[PDB]
Structure 1
Amino acid sequence: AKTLLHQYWDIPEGTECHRKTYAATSIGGASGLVVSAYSVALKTPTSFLEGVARTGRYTFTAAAIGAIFGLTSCISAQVREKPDDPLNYLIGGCAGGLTLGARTRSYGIGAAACAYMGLTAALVKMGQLEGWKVFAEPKV
């Protein structure tokens, strides 16, 4: 999963929308596959068809969220000519939250997911700009 994030992050922002969208789709599909694997492990479905339906549903939902987030972020970065600006990532996070609300068929989940994932994506872009470290190599 190290190569997927590096593949998504080395593409310049606002240059190629399709490759960035494909990379975000792959990241979302991987996360959804992990989530669905844990779900069918701990909570056993009643049948094989129900299990593969749940796995496909989770993977498709996460892939749609990632694809729409990447497409919206790249579209905002191209439209505003501001590649190093976290507001495009905030817009993409809110678009992903609206996608999650559409997949869950509810509005409050969509609004809350918009707000929280927009803040999270803005923070991720902020950390990429400022060189923040989450798993810091010990030095002292």
Structure 2
Amino acid sequence: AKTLLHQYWDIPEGTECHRKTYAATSIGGASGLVVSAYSVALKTPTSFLEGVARTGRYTFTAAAIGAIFGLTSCISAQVREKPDDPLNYLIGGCAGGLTLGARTRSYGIGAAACAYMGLTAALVKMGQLEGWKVFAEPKV
């Protein structure tokens, strides 16, 4: 799931909504699948049906988060005519936080998820623009 990040970043910001939406949806689906698999491995499911219900709930929730965040970031980048702006990713992160709060049946959690996911997406744009490297190769 490394090349999926490249395919997400190969599409320019605020140019084509569809492929960015499916790339973000696939990223969310993969993340939800990893989280659900670890939850099933660590927390023993009651049965097969409840286990796949929890897996489907986590996977569909994370896929919806990814699709909403990507769609909102793309429409904000189109409506501001500025791909090189962290405001679009902030708005997309808040939309993802609102969707997560609506899925979790909460509103304070939704506002906190708005704030934190918007800040995280803003920092993702910061690293994309200024070339921040958290996984830096040994240089000296």
Distance in 2 (CA, whole Å) between partners of 1:98 and 1:89 is 14
Distance in 2 (CA, whole Å) between partners of 1:7 and 1:127 is 17
- Per-residue CA shift, 1:77-123, capped at 9, x if unaligned? 00000101000000000000000000001001100000000000000
Identity %: 100
Task: Give 1:16 shift.
Answer: 0.7
Task: Give 1:18 shift.
Answer: 0.7
Task: Give 1:20 shift.
Answer: 0.2
Distance in 2 (CA, whole Å) between partners of 1:25 and 1:107 is 23
The TM-score, its normalising length taken from structure 1, stands at: 0.99
Distance in 1 (CA, whole Å) between partners of 2:46 and 2:133 is 43
Distance in 2 (CA, whole Å) between partners of 1:132 and 1:45 is 40
Structure 1's consecutive aligned runs of 4 or more residues displaced over 2 angstroms after TM superposition are none
The TM-score, its normalising length taken from structure 2, stands at: 0.99
Give the secondary structure class of the aligned counterpart of 1:8: helix
Give the secondary structure class of the aligned counterpart of 1:52: helix
Does the alignment pair 1:66 with 2:66?
Answer: yes
Distance in 2 (CA, whole Å) between partners of 1:59 and 1:127 is 27
Alignment of 1:1-140 (within 5 A): 1-140=1-140
Note the residue ranges of structure 2 that are not aligned, 5 or more in a row: none
- Per-residue CA shift, 1:58-84, capped at 9, x if unaligned? 000000000000000000000000101
Paired residues, what number? 140
The alignment's C-alpha RMSD in Å is: 0.4
Distance in 1 (CA, whole Å) between partners of 2:36 and 2:132 is 31
Distance in 2 (CA, whole Å) between partners of 1:3 and 1:99 is 26
Distance in 2 (CA, whole Å) between partners of 1:46 and 1:78 is 47
Give the secondary structure class of the aligned counterpart of 1:121: helix
